[PDB]
């Protein structure tokens, strides 16, 4: 054959990938995650898994055709979870998503039932992986994925409020004329309607905005910074109303988390984890607090010092999640 | 105001961006171009333009929400082309897109009409820009943009066979077990069924595949390497059939061209340009040849030495194209 | 000619660089700046200037030889400043450096003499440039560069405490087991012995470490965090003692600042600027405060809220610097 | 403790670790290039001068905010190199002004007798990337001392020579080196072989446009481009005392292919017995497919009778030198 005329093989090709990533779900979110991960050079192998055969193969092919411009030498796909074997990171984006006017919390029954199939198949073929849950409601589904998988909780991470916080920082930067990277602010709790803007931590260069404007974030605020958090709460719905779904921002947020995990960076992100034992929470609620994220997932949790109102709001968010979570069967 | 309590302003700045890129059309291809350009840090401003107000705004907001994870500090959009002012590079992806089974040539009058609106407005707000045409049929539409714009030919560029050649190199790499970066081969002429694979230039490490197999690419070829070119030609149709459109590979391909232009790299790409004076072409025909691409667009063309067959294909591939443009309604 | 047989020139047009950076001085610091800038793809042209012709040509050549692995297509050098023409950023690293036991402030009369030649020659050819001063004492020398050039203050920047704060954050990171990216804290004032750690701003995820231990940074601190600031102050001298000079950290710090400028990011950095008007400083003192940095240099200054002790230490640094400024002879 | 007031700990070993042996200019250029390409989750430095080594490590560590490599470590003790995927050897005598690289061989063989077993002890499954000169001989020596299979012992070889050739070609043609193709093979030194037959832009053979290409009869004396390739290190040594930046970038390129399993083709030094007519345990540069298991495959270039004689000449030296070494 021409190959053997051109190339003498010197080594029997027993290839196993060292930095493999799998994306489960090839909808808009799953593919935004995939392109973002490919463009950040995080993986030596990318696997895609979903249940619509043609769509799956099409997306795989489309990515493959860009290989010249990438540094991820193997892209593969299958309905069959065997294709995901040996992953270091598996990103779960499959399941129903909310219609306009529908809460993420309304997806729980559908997505728990889908997780009962997906999670055991993932763990079967990728015993060393971290699980990164993106599907909604992400906080509850991280709990569900954790219980189903048999993984210790450090290895099951919800994309959580990493996106809400990035949205908050974008909006804040726009108001201040400063890059989001230098505008610090944390949105914690549910990735959803009950998220908590932590005004007391909002700062540029370590200067607290609340110390300059004590009314910051209340209705008494002349500049109505509370509308920043409302915009954050509403952003999924506003973008769904305009383009039908959201994809790019969540894709970049997931890639950001994947980078911290794959590169063992130990950066702090607001992501879904067990918060039992903090702020008086007694049940296995998962929600976003600032977490140290590295090669073994979430190794540490930062204990944010919240105002009485912030803490009340965070407890109220835990309560809302528990209200849905305690009724689940799986 | 809180901003003024926090920040003392030194000057009212000259706000003209220095590395602005505009993407016209926020369909799947336009957005894939957008996200790829964002992830390659090519621009200090990205502007989006299209005619569907909500979709446009939705896409802009979604990109904006990822700003924390990017290094492109201003992302803007409008149906009004004034938002595109001072672009170094304007990428046109707007217009009708190819349905399943539909040929690119079938898009030609619809898109020539769309270009009568688009191109003058682009030229109005960025008279010094380079135009990068992606919409199909890309060869004919690059000609149309050139005639309408009044720009010198160096600044009107078609994405042409850049992706086709990328696909060839991927498929070649899959056959040889080599990364496509190290697999070389050129697909030239019309971006479509009449493209030409230049068998003589197909090589790895300067070793010509044709010298190892003199029947390479011909019907007597035992490994039927011509099927690699058939796959190249059929790729977009196969992918459209599977997922409804193509996006990722063309997006990456365009970002690669954007990179050469914006960073003045003077890499050689097979892209659509005015080849009158070459291969016995005496009309104002645009098609892909290897072009040196930098900050003034296409400054130079590589003269590929074609076999008599390869060159006959090209002068035909030409007339296939020039038949149509001779009689265009604009 | 072979070039003419292979390539048809289609365009005579004068290449004028769009993103040029000049590095003045090709000692260890200058070359660390150059390689870092090259590896961050910040420039379409790099110019080097120094006074020793062989060393200059050798360094230029060595960088040139790595061009295949870079995306900066023109690397040039000369002892003549005409080579620097049309730079957007000019980085000044030439001058004497301190010995062990010697203060950076002892370099002032030598480096003012050098600056009286270098500065007028730099500004002559680059009307759009920002001047980024790295040579020591950097704060004083930014004042000198500003006086000699007659540039407005936004355009004359000293690398200042960008490195000192990077070191602070590294050492804080080490203590806390968190990446320095997530460890926030500001060292302001002189890049030297009189620098000021802003304990009140030191935080992770918005949580003030001083709020948790109000003794943080004082002599009553059980954990002696003041030693972290002492390590920052002593870092150049410790490294000089071990390897003879410092290069890598300052090179990365300068490239960080070049990135904000070249990409108009508007990130906040602790860099040397004119602080007359702030903290009741009444003289044209330059020193590090958090500055918003972009394509027009420093457009805005963050007014950090300092404790009375922190403010007194910053005024003390300002006094020290003013005292040396009063020794300057133009 | 402040840390505990701030952080609740829940969990109490690197996956992509690279070691650079030698913190001379070459080693540190490799180190900075590897750091700026985000190739490693841990970088270890090893050398014999303890102060210089600590100073370099610290200087790198202070830039950590600006990097994505979260652990940088150093020691004279090779235990610091444990769990390396890739170990890059840059230590030894360096080429001196006006002297062949072959003048370093005995001294660097001696150094390798100490270095290589220590590397092998702590990372028995690493890929070894030899950079020290003369790189072809020392890659052979590393292979013999380590006992590794030949795929995992790689010499930087002519990777930079070919990068220089493409730079020079590019300057002549007004084209980026990424688009100018051409291979320098054989010994990394004065007897390297420019393969004129493969020199091309966009698949267009330069020889086809100028049949005399690379010969004495060449009107444009393209052989001078190879002469400049051969002379490059000597000229830069003359001017600045050593070379560092281009080699660091070349090494980081090879590290990239290995660490990311790219299977790109590089002209690097490999055990070429059986291939290209050679019968002894000799290493020299040919185009190799490079990935996570080192060199898995070699491209067979159709060489002219000359290119083949030279490569047998360029070759024959090395075995004569290697037969006389003992370890
Ligand atoms: C699995 O589907 C999704 C998961 C998360 C998002 C992100 C989205 C959300 O959480 O609804 C957002 O906040 O933009 C979008 C999805 O589908 C479009
Ligand atoms: C704007 O529409 C398109 C332009 C180019 C491509 C790329 C396509 C082609 O050029 O036919 C391909 O090769 O995938 C696809 C488009 O719509 C999906
Ligand atoms: C131009 O000389 C220098 C400027 C700054 C530094 C940085 C250095 C210092 O300020 O002494 C440091 O803090 O590491 C080092 C230089 O020469 C080695
Ligand atoms: C460790 O010694 C070296 C190894 C390679 C180079 C690179 C050099 C060469 O290979 O001769 C070159 O080509 O620049 C330089 C060295 O010392 C400075």
Tab-separated table of C-alpha atoms in Angstrom, chain A residues 69-256:
chain	number	residue	atom	x	y	z
A	69	UNK	CA	-6.765	24.215	12.493
A	70	UNK	CA	-6.841	22.357	15.815
A	71	UNK	CA	-4.463	20.380	18.101
A	72	UNK	CA	-6.823	17.593	19.143
A	73	UNK	CA	-5.761	14.710	16.906
A	74	UNK	CA	-8.739	12.373	17.455
A	75	UNK	CA	-12.433	13.244	17.341
A	76	UNK	CA	-14.925	10.390	17.581
A	77	UNK	CA	-18.603	9.800	18.219
A	78	UNK	CA	-21.121	7.076	18.893
A	79	UNK	CA	-24.520	6.373	20.473
A	80	UNK	CA	-22.487	3.745	22.338
A	81	UNK	CA	-20.758	4.862	25.532
A	82	UNK	CA	-17.773	2.593	24.730
A	83	UNK	CA	-16.581	5.482	22.563
A	84	UNK	CA	-16.182	7.571	25.811
A	85	UNK	CA	-13.736	5.088	27.424
A	86	UNK	CA	-10.751	6.430	29.327
A	87	UNK	CA	-12.015	9.993	29.629
A	88	UNK	CA	-10.413	12.350	32.193
A	89	UNK	CA	-13.398	14.673	31.957
A	90	UNK	CA	-17.010	13.954	30.921
A	91	UNK	CA	-19.284	16.952	30.382
A	92	UNK	CA	-23.041	16.189	30.643
A	93	UNK	CA	-25.209	18.485	28.511
A	94	UNK	CA	-28.000	16.127	27.419
A	95	UNK	CA	-31.636	16.341	28.483
A	96	UNK	CA	-34.590	18.649	28.174
A	97	UNK	CA	-34.146	22.418	28.361
A	98	UNK	CA	-36.655	25.024	29.451
A	99	UNK	CA	-39.136	26.670	27.118
A	100	UNK	CA	-39.785	30.375	27.419
A	101	UNK	CA	-41.566	30.988	30.739
A	102	UNK	CA	-40.489	27.573	32.171
A	103	UNK	CA	-38.172	27.204	35.201
A	104	UNK	CA	-35.034	25.075	35.022
A	105	UNK	CA	-36.523	23.311	38.073
A	106	UNK	CA	-39.377	21.985	35.867
A	107	UNK	CA	-36.885	19.858	33.941
A	108	UNK	CA	-35.913	17.715	36.951
A	109	UNK	CA	-38.128	14.655	36.389
A	110	UNK	CA	-37.160	14.387	32.701
A	111	UNK	CA	-33.487	14.934	33.357
A	112	UNK	CA	-33.226	12.671	36.421
A	113	UNK	CA	-34.721	9.891	34.275
A	114	UNK	CA	-32.181	10.603	31.489
A	115	UNK	CA	-29.347	10.682	34.087
A	116	UNK	CA	-30.341	7.199	35.330
A	117	UNK	CA	-29.221	5.961	31.875
A	118	UNK	CA	-26.349	8.374	31.128
A	119	UNK	CA	-24.435	8.453	34.443
A	120	UNK	CA	-23.885	4.681	34.954
A	121	UNK	CA	-22.711	4.341	31.341
A	122	UNK	CA	-20.238	7.151	31.736
A	123	UNK	CA	-18.750	5.791	34.981
A	124	UNK	CA	-18.556	2.303	33.427
A	125	UNK	CA	-16.031	3.361	30.796
A	126	UNK	CA	-14.255	6.312	32.477
A	127	UNK	CA	-13.327	5.254	36.016
A	128	UNK	CA	-10.815	8.116	36.403
A	129	UNK	CA	-13.003	10.944	35.154
A	130	UNK	CA	-14.403	14.003	36.745
A	131	UNK	CA	-18.056	14.625	35.920
A	132	UNK	CA	-19.008	18.146	34.886
A	133	UNK	CA	-22.799	18.550	34.970
A	134	UNK	CA	-24.279	21.279	32.735
A	135	UNK	CA	-27.836	20.002	32.230
A	136	UNK	CA	-30.554	21.745	34.306
A	137	UNK	CA	-31.495	22.177	37.024
A	138	UNK	CA	-27.741	21.838	37.344
A	139	UNK	CA	-27.499	21.992	41.137
A	140	UNK	CA	-30.011	19.213	41.708
A	141	UNK	CA	-28.599	17.181	38.825
A	142	UNK	CA	-25.070	17.387	40.328
A	143	UNK	CA	-26.529	15.844	43.485
A	144	UNK	CA	-28.329	13.240	41.375
A	145	UNK	CA	-25.201	12.489	39.282
A	146	UNK	CA	-23.200	12.230	42.532
A	147	UNK	CA	-25.637	9.734	44.111
A	148	UNK	CA	-25.927	7.642	40.909
A	149	UNK	CA	-22.247	7.556	39.958
A	150	UNK	CA	-20.636	6.195	43.093
A	151	UNK	CA	-17.979	8.889	42.725
A	152	UNK	CA	-16.841	10.880	45.720
A	153	UNK	CA	-18.362	14.335	45.755
A	154	UNK	CA	-15.132	16.144	44.778
A	155	UNK	CA	-15.405	14.480	41.348
A	156	UNK	CA	-18.940	15.614	40.529
A	157	UNK	CA	-19.129	19.297	39.666
A	158	UNK	CA	-22.024	21.440	38.520
A	159	UNK	CA	-21.251	24.244	36.099
A	160	UNK	CA	-23.464	26.172	38.553
A	161	UNK	CA	-23.027	29.961	38.833
A	162	UNK	CA	-19.739	30.225	36.939
A	163	UNK	CA	-21.841	31.684	34.044
A	164	UNK	CA	-24.057	33.872	36.269
A	165	UNK	CA	-20.942	35.336	37.871
A	166	UNK	CA	-19.368	35.929	34.423
A	167	UNK	CA	-22.580	37.673	33.374
A	168	UNK	CA	-22.526	39.777	36.494
A	169	UNK	CA	-18.909	40.765	35.817
A	170	UNK	CA	-19.622	41.580	32.161
A	171	UNK	CA	-22.504	43.889	33.176
A	172	UNK	CA	-20.481	45.445	36.011
A	173	UNK	CA	-17.555	46.075	33.673
A	174	UNK	CA	-19.869	47.714	31.150
A	175	UNK	CA	-21.100	50.077	33.870
A	176	UNK	CA	-17.579	50.909	35.097
A	177	UNK	CA	-15.648	50.832	31.782
A	178	UNK	CA	-13.324	48.133	33.117
A	179	UNK	CA	-12.647	44.684	31.692
A	180	UNK	CA	-14.672	41.936	33.446
A	181	UNK	CA	-11.334	40.320	34.460
A	182	UNK	CA	-10.722	43.275	36.816
A	183	UNK	CA	-14.349	43.543	37.983
A	184	UNK	CA	-14.936	41.129	40.881
A	185	UNK	CA	-18.350	39.953	42.015
A	186	UNK	CA	-19.905	36.623	43.047
A	187	UNK	CA	-23.371	35.257	42.268
A	188	UNK	CA	-23.948	32.186	44.438
A	189	UNK	CA	-26.714	29.682	45.257
A	190	UNK	CA	-29.015	28.253	42.592
A	191	UNK	CA	-28.105	28.590	38.925
A	192	UNK	CA	-31.567	29.980	38.496
A	193	UNK	CA	-34.133	32.421	39.806
A	194	UNK	CA	-32.995	32.266	43.455
A	195	UNK	CA	-29.280	33.103	42.859
A	196	UNK	CA	-27.663	35.501	45.311
A	197	UNK	CA	-25.588	38.515	44.314
A	198	UNK	CA	-22.931	38.988	47.041
A	199	UNK	CA	-22.778	42.779	47.062
A	200	UNK	CA	-20.415	42.886	49.982
A	201	UNK	CA	-17.688	41.202	47.889
A	202	UNK	CA	-18.137	43.350	44.772
A	203	UNK	CA	-14.889	45.181	44.152
A	204	UNK	CA	-12.363	46.611	41.736
A	205	UNK	CA	-8.684	46.486	42.817
A	206	UNK	CA	-9.898	45.471	46.255
A	207	UNK	CA	-12.097	48.553	46.661
A	208	UNK	CA	-15.539	47.502	47.877
A	209	UNK	CA	-18.337	49.145	45.825
A	210	UNK	CA	-20.730	48.725	48.778
A	211	UNK	CA	-18.351	50.754	50.999
A	212	UNK	CA	-18.545	53.626	48.452
A	213	UNK	CA	-22.335	53.201	47.972
A	214	UNK	CA	-23.852	51.586	51.059
A	215	UNK	CA	-27.204	51.273	49.242
A	216	UNK	CA	-25.548	49.150	46.508
A	217	UNK	CA	-27.975	46.472	45.350
A	218	UNK	CA	-31.047	47.685	47.262
A	219	UNK	CA	-34.072	49.444	45.749
A	220	UNK	CA	-32.861	52.577	47.557
A	221	UNK	CA	-29.834	52.509	45.199
A	222	UNK	CA	-29.872	55.628	42.964
A	223	UNK	CA	-28.145	53.680	40.160
A	224	UNK	CA	-30.202	50.530	40.733
A	225	UNK	CA	-27.376	47.979	40.721
A	226	UNK	CA	-29.996	45.424	41.682
A	227	UNK	CA	-31.026	45.535	37.995
A	228	UNK	CA	-27.570	44.026	37.252
A	229	UNK	CA	-28.533	40.863	39.193
A	230	UNK	CA	-32.024	40.903	37.679
A	231	UNK	CA	-30.437	40.987	34.239
A	232	UNK	CA	-28.279	38.053	35.325
A	233	UNK	CA	-31.322	36.133	36.597
A	234	UNK	CA	-33.206	37.010	33.366
A	235	UNK	CA	-30.379	36.534	30.894
A	236	UNK	CA	-31.191	32.898	29.939
A	237	UNK	CA	-34.820	33.843	29.307
A	238	UNK	CA	-33.981	37.070	27.521
A	239	UNK	CA	-31.513	35.272	25.209
A	240	UNK	CA	-33.938	32.334	24.670
A	241	UNK	CA	-36.672	34.849	23.691
A	242	UNK	CA	-34.266	36.449	21.166
A	243	UNK	CA	-32.356	33.507	19.507
A	244	UNK	CA	-34.265	30.409	20.755
A	245	UNK	CA	-31.603	29.099	23.128
A	246	UNK	CA	-28.252	30.069	24.686
A	247	UNK	CA	-24.967	28.410	23.711
A	248	UNK	CA	-21.815	30.536	23.468
A	249	UNK	CA	-21.561	31.962	26.977
A	250	UNK	CA	-22.325	28.605	28.682
A	251	UNK	CA	-19.845	26.963	26.316
A	252	UNK	CA	-17.092	29.380	27.334
A	253	UNK	CA	-18.029	28.947	31.022
A	254	UNK	CA	-17.768	25.128	30.787
A	255	UNK	CA	-14.435	25.381	28.889
A	256	UNK	CA	-13.171	27.672	31.694
